[PDB]
């Protein structure tokens, strides 16, 4: 659970990267 | 560590809604 945790948590950091990168194109 | 991988995997949902917005607007 603290391994899945830890994946979910460095997509989580992907996806917030991912909305900035959206958020300055718009 | 089960209910922070659940509040992890909502956020990302929420996350997935947002970009999917995001990528509509932009």
């Not at 917030?16 to 958020?23: D, F, H, K, N």
């Amino acid at each position: 659970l603290a391994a899945k945790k830890q994946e979910l948590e460095e997509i989580l950091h992907e996806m917030e990267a991912r909305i900035e990168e959206e958020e300055e194109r718009s």
